[PDB]
Specification:
This is part of a larger assembly, with two copies of chain A (122 residues), two copies of chain B (88 residues), one copy of chain C (181 residues), one copy of chain D (38 residues) and two copies of chain E (384 residues).
Chain A lengths: L3 H12 L2 H17 L9 H4 L5 H8 L3 H20 L19 H18 L2
Helix pairs in contact in A: 4-6
Chain D lengths: L1 H23 L5 H8 L1
Chain E lengths: L2 H4 L1 H11 L2 E3 L8 H20 L6 H13 L4 H28 L8 H24 L3 H14 L6 H9 L6 H32 L13 E3 H26 L29 H9 L3 H21 L11 H21 L5 H37 L2
Antiparallel strand pairs in E: 1-2
Helix pairs in contact in E: 3-5, 3-9, 3-10, 4-5, 5-10, 6-7, 6-9, 6-12, 11-12, 11-13, 11-14, 12-14, 13-14
The chains are: A mainly alpha (122), B mainly alpha (88), C alpha+beta (181), D mainly alpha (38), E mainly alpha (384).
The complex binds protoporphyrin IX containing FE (4 copies), ligand ZL5 (2 copies) and FE2/S2 (inorganic) cluster (FES).
The site of FE2/S2 (inorganic) cluster (FES) has 11 residues of chain C, from loops.
PDB class: membrane protein
Keywords: Candida albicans, mitochondrial complex III2, indazole-derivative inhibitor, Rieske head domain, membrane protein
Entry title: Complex III2 from Candida albicans, Inz-5 bound
Chain lengths: 122, 88, 181, 38, 384, 384, 88, 122
């Protein structure tokens, strides 16, 4: 529901101030680690709700290699959920591998949608 | 009908060419390969991972309920009668 | 083309027929256990359609017998169907003495249709489209089926009409001035 | 065709359960108690 | 084309039960749906087999029920099946809704589905209560009286609508006959809403625990999920047999076996267990109109849940704070239900007010705040 | 996409009522279907509003009906609406089937539809009879007795099945309660068969008077045929008002207002008018088992009609001999119905036997022979 | 789904290129252009064309019914009593 | 239902004998005239039940000009039935235009189907 643009704006709002970054960033890292999605072979962007015209547009706009890697990650996560087993730390998605690859495309789609809404509303 | 799920021919999934799937005919595989190890180790793993999220809310709510129940019991006991008159 | 993952551990130790035979046995056993359970449930439910204990208790209820005018036809309500309890006089017995092996859909005699002429019991429900026959309109002298005009003989035999059989005689037994169903 | 196995299972379970229940509830049944109140 | 796909009816049955592309990752919590259907079916069956022996008349109602118990062959079995199957239907529905909340099945693509579901829930309670009034036990009679009196709180039409629903000046033979008819019917309207719910599901398919697209890996409902449905169905029937045969009256209230008389009020007028959470709210709110408004809002706010859930990720399986909040909400709901059956004691009245407050606060604050905070935390964590 | 085509429910409503491509050449005879639906709806509505005041108990049934007539506000109106709407439902259904036979809507593409329709017809009468037994008038009681006795004719299970359906040793309170429950339900199972019939129709669409492909010129159901349906609905409701208000009891039988008692048999045990054609057959066949077999065959042979109709041309509008045979069949059916209500007099019994003979001979001889002869005549005429 | 009727885009009709259709907005046309002439002349034409097929079967069936009814009436009157006994 | 081949065979069975042709042919002509389909602009072949795989195949193989003429005739018949009016004798289909244009194609399709059934049944 929340626009990816809004959450990115809030994250940059916080990150611009070390007073809050030094407090929240460790908490955010711990919360992402405890979220449990990495151990299933998923990156943050894979969890995003696809069933949204903006999101579907962004995925359709994704490069072939990234799209195939995402397909494999989703399939692996589904298999792990089905088998009720998790990857070990060796095979789990390392924190540095959460590259937020899909955020640029989603932000571009959101910018296009917002421009459309702004222009047609005048 | 831009449903986010289609039928088998086109389920709405993106192209996934470089992935390969593998399975054995069930007539050739064990049904109980992991049952013994799973039911203990895997079940305990799931329970341990999910415990805190159930325990903390449960302990909070049950502590509140126990406090309320004990207070009510004290009220309706003779020793609490006067207080029952004071509170009401 | 490429290396497959090793299933060595995953493999079953059974032969081709053994594993398939056991799987089909288990599936068939599940199917037939489900069939047995569904049969039990459906029979238990359908037994609700059957007469409840109240109805069974109410039936087989004796009738207050006793002295009554000869030739008069009494009425009862045993098991809903009217009962044509009539104390036909000796004239009816004498008339029934004339045997009939022909011109009767079911030749019979008072030998089996009644225990004693002093008390004659017969359900009033007719044969074809069961109705209550009139007690004096019978063409043969007994009861008459108004719906089709069928005539019931004094012995209950079907004389004329669409009667498929003879006037049924309930299973009521007789006793000392009492009816013992 | 199926009804045969279903009926066989029904009868098997019914007779087995009835026998076991009667033996386990022997003393408490009316049939065994009536003699004492005769 | 296979005959299951050419024939229109077999085509529909295939689309819904045989080749329906369910996600491969759906766990047993997704088998409750079919379970609920089974429950409805069994209920209707039992209900029909009770209508053949139940008498709607007020003077014959309870006596006819006892006739079913004592005289009708297997009448006790059908009566208990119906009564306990109402409770089991609501257990399955509560777990159904709990799964929907936990795994975020209420989000955008299935919002339509959500609303139908919510309607069904309301309708179902407005079928359960009515059924409970048919027995015309002490609890039945006084529950009918209490609910109809609460209906009078409406300002403009409440003064005369209550006799309209009663059919008289108080709960009497017209009321029980009316409830019997509407209660025989409303489950059959609900069978239509169940079909509508199934179609609203089929348009977009079913979610999965991971909260991501199932299109990458789908499996036909038959045989896999058909047999999972059989497992859950046999488990449900086994527990249902435990209750029906070995402990049927524990879920019910003993006072309902007392022939109802308006002149005697039981010491505690309380609904069956599964209406307790809502009735608690009704007890907590002072104003009668406010009480009924809040009681129905406690259900209808589920319609607002999809819009108050600002999460960019479906479900909670990967959401620490959301899982904690959801479990706290579930335990608060259980506490509210538990308070529902207790008398009006000082700590209980204050705790019921606080419990209703937090029950609504969940939807209107916690889900928004928690979801936004968690989106921010995810992005600011993975940003490195 | 318009909202009427994207939304699943509005999509279905569109596919069936808005852009359903009906042939442009369909006359008013094709509006009976919707009419029947309306009839069913109104019946259900009336029925529900009767269930709220009717008592299933045998001792209270007729008295409760009179309570509806005399004391319940608009109770007379609803009672008469239900009673006369049964007859009007069967009038519409008979015209429905007559149209299907005349315009050959029973041929290959819609055979499935035909089958469903036949089932519905049977079900409908097995709902009408049930309803007629609820009032427990003299005719009600004795009709129930006659029918249940006829069911005893089955050799292996007929001896004990009759008590099973009765719930006792004769028509009594269990029988009336059972009929009340089954009669409230079976119409709702028939509401499902109506939907099945509609889908079996929608798969191949509706026929047309000309008996040729409608695909050359199709028009949306709305507005044209929606407004034609409105015309026929208002005409039907106007005639229904005539009967309900100004002459309600003409279709019924006076004896049904006598409280039923098993001890007194009315001079003539006869069904309502629209069961007469079938009961006539039941009267004509000597054997009870043979009688019931022939009575149900008189309906089921409609299932054989599509295969016995060897015509290469759909419908009869362009078929002299077929039209003549169909009209003679219709008049024979009317004569059979008329004989149904008369006593068993000599000329009437022989005429009933001959009428049944020709009624079955229609399907099993005339349609085959006439259709083949007409195909031959067409080809040998146009061959020049 | 080889249904012999499809949806609007493809109703299953064959190619019909060389046919043209013409209609006037109802907002511009008479509703009652033919009503007066139709209801009499056209209705009489339809009735006359379809009459024989209704009349001949109706005449046959009603003649048989009249014969049967008259015979039964004669039977149940006094003059027919003896024959009623003879036939039965 | 009846195969067009069977009806054609019966018609030739009759026509081969003047003893029966001289009796039935006038009757058949009168029956077709009274059938009332000609006054609607239809030919006999237009009345044939299209909804049959053999009939659909025969129609599909029909020449373009015949197919278009048939489409126009069917449309005209539908319009006439809709308007409850009939063509006058001048505009009606004269007996000589009932050319049985579709029979050859239907017979070809029937022969193919019968050959298939006969061959696969051995
Ligand atoms: C009362 C009878 C019900 C029937 C027959 C039914 C049927 C189903 C079925 C079969 C499913 C898919 C499998 C499953 O979720 O178990 C489903 C999904 C769902 N149901 Fe129901 N259900 C019922 C009750 C409800 C109610 C009252 C709600 C109200 C919120 C509800 C909410 C949902 C949701 C949100 C989903 C989507 C789940 C997902 O996508 O993962 N269900 N329904
Ligand atoms: C969603 C569907 C239904 C639900 C949730 C439901 C619920 C209930 C409940 C909770 C009771 C109270 C029983 C007790 O207190 O022991 C009850 C009683 C009853 N219901 Fe239902 N009901 C449903 C459908 C039906 C149907 C379909 C029928 C009839 C066709 C029916 C007829 C009755 C009758 C006759 C009783 C009282 C009979 C007795 O207990 O002896 N109900 N129902
Ligand atoms: C296709 C649907 C139905 C048909 C054809 C039908 C037919 C009939 C008929 C012929 C009667 C006899 C009335 C008389 O002799 O005056 C009757 C009575 C009755 N039916 Fe229906 N019925 C239908 C559906 C229903 C429904 C849905 C209900 C209840 C919801 C219902 C409840 C009753 C009752 C209570 C009576 C007797 C009440 C009275 O006459 O006062 N029936 N029905
Ligand atoms: C009882 C409720 C019924 C409903 C709701 C219903 C509904 C419909 C509708 C709306 C149509 C299309 C319009 C029309 O034909 O008037 C139709 C067609 C048809 N119906 Fe029914 N109908 C009913 C009864 C029956 C029955 C009992 C039969 C049994 C044979 C039947 C046989 C047919 C046939 C053969 C058609 C196809 C007509 C054609 O294609 O021209 N109908 N139905
Ligand atoms: C006995 C009793 C007392 C107080 C309230 C109720 C209710 C009740 C009904 C509704 C609804 F409007 F939905 F009808 C809402 C809230 C409620 F508290 N119902 N009952 C009897 C009962 N309880 N549970 N069942 C299966 N029946 C009460
Ligand atoms: C009063 C009466 C007498 C004789 C027969 C009947 C029937 C009847 C019922 C069935 C069916 F098996 F379908 F039930 C079939 C044939 C029948 F002749 N019914 N009735 C009462 C009645 N008549 N018309 N209605 C609306 N009810 C009779
Ligand atoms: S009354 Fe129908 S045959 Fe006896």
């Amino acid at each position: 529901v929340q626009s990816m643009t809004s959450v990115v704006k809030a994250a940059n709002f916080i990150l611009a101030r070390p007073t809050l970054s030094k407090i929240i960033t460790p908490l955010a890292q711990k919360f992402t680690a405890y979220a449990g999605y990495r151990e299933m072979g998923l990156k943050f962007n894979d969890l995003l709700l696809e069933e949204t015209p903006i999101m579907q547009t962004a995925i359709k706009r994704l490069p072939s290699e990234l799209n195939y890697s995402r397909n494999f990650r989703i399939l692996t996560a589904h298999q792990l959920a089905l088998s009720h087993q998790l990857l070990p730390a060796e095979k789990a998605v390392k924190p540095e591998e959460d590259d937020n690859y899909l955020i640029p495309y989603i932000l571009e789609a959101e910018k296009e949608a917002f421009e459309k809404a702004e222009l047609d509303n005048i | 009908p831009h449903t986010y799920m289609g039928w088998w021919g086109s389920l709405g999934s993106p192209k996934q060419k470089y992935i390969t799937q593998y399975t054995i005919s069930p007539y050739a595989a064990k049904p109980l390969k992991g049952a013994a190890y799973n039911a203990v180790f895997n079940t305990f793993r799931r329970t341990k991972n999910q415990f805190l999220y159930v325990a903390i809310p449960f302990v909070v709510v049950w502590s509140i309920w126990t406090r309320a129940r004990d207070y009510n019991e004290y009220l309706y006991t003779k020793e609490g009668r006067e207080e029952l008159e004071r509170v009401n | 083309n490429y290396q497959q993952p090793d299933y060595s551990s995953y493999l079953n130790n059974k032969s081709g027929q053994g594993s398939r035979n056991f799987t089909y046995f288990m599936v068939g056993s599940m199917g037939l256990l489900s069939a047995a359970g569904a049969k039990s449930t459906v029979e238990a439910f359908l037994s609700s359609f059957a007469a409840s204990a109240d109805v069974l208790a109410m039936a087989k209820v004796e009738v207050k017998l006793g002295a009554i005018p000869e030739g008069k036809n009494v009425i009862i309500k045993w098991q809903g169907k009217p009962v044509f309890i009539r104390h036909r006089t000796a004239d009816e017995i004498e008339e029934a003495n004339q045997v009939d092996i022909k011109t009767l859909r079911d030749p019979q005699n008072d030998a089996d249709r009644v225990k004693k002429p002093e008390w004659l019991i017969m359900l009033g429900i007719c044969t074809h489209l069961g109705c209550v026959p009139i007690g004096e309109a019978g063409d043969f002298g007994g009861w008459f089926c108004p719906c089709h005009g069928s005539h019931y003989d004094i012995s209950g035999r079907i004389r004329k009409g669409p009667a498929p059989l003879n006037l049924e005689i309930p299973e009521y037994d007789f006793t000392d001035d009492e009816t013992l169903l | 065709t199926i009804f045969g196995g279903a009926f066989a299972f029904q009868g098997f379970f019914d007779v087995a359960v009835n026998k076991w229940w009667e033996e386990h509830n022997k003393a408490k049944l009316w049939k065994n108690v009536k003699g004492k109140f005769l | 084309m296979p005959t299951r796909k050419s024939n229109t009816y077999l085509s529909l049955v295939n689309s819904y039960l045989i080749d329906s592309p369910q996600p491969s990752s759906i766990n047993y919590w997704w088998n409750l749906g079919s379970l609920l259907g089974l429950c409805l079916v069994i209920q209707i069956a039992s209900g029909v087999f009770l209508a053949m022996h139940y008498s709607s008349n007020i003077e014959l109602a309870f006596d006819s029920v006892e006739h079913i118990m004592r005289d009708v062959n297997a009448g006790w079995l059908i009566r208990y099946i119906h009564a306990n199957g109402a409770s089991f239907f609501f257990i399955c529905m509560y777990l159904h809704i709990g799964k929907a909340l936990y795994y975020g099945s209420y989000k955008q693509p299935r919002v339509m589905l959500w609303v139908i579901g919510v309607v069904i829930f309301i309708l179902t309670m407005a079928i359960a209560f009515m059924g409970y009034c048919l027995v015309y036990g002490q609890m039945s009679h006084w529950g009918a009286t209490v609910i109809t009196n609460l209906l009078s709180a409406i300002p403009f039409i409440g003064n005369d609508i209550v006799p309209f629903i009663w059919g008289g000046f108080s709960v009497s033979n017209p009321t029980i006959q009316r409830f019997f008819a509407l209660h025989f019917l409303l489950p059959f309207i609900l069978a239509a809403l169940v079909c509508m719910h199934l179609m609203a599901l089929h348009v977009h398919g079913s979610s999965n625990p991971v909260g991501i697209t199932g299109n990458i890996d789908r499996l036909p409902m038959h045989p896999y999920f058909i047999f999972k449905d059989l497992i859950t169905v046999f488990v449900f029937l086994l527990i249902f047999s435990l209750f029906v045969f070995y402990s049927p009256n524990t879920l019910g209230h003993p006072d309902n076996y007392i022939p109802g008389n308006p002149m005697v009020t039981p010491p505690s007028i309380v609904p069956e267990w599964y209406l307790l959470p809502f009735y608690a709210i009704l007890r907590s709110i002072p104003d009668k109109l406010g009480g009924v408004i809040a009681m129905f809002g406690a259900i209808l706010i589920l319609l607002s849940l999809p819009y108050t859930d600002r999460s960019i990720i479906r479900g909670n399986s990967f959401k620490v704070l959301s899982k904690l909040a959801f479990y706290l909400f579930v335990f608060n709901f259980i506490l509210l239900g538990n308070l529902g059956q207790l008398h009006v004691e000082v700590p209980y009245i204050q705790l019921g007010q606080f419990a209703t407050a937090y029950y609504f606060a969940h939807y209107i604050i916690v889900v928004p705040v928690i979801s936004t905070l968690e989106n921010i935390l995810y992005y600011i964590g993975t940003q490195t």
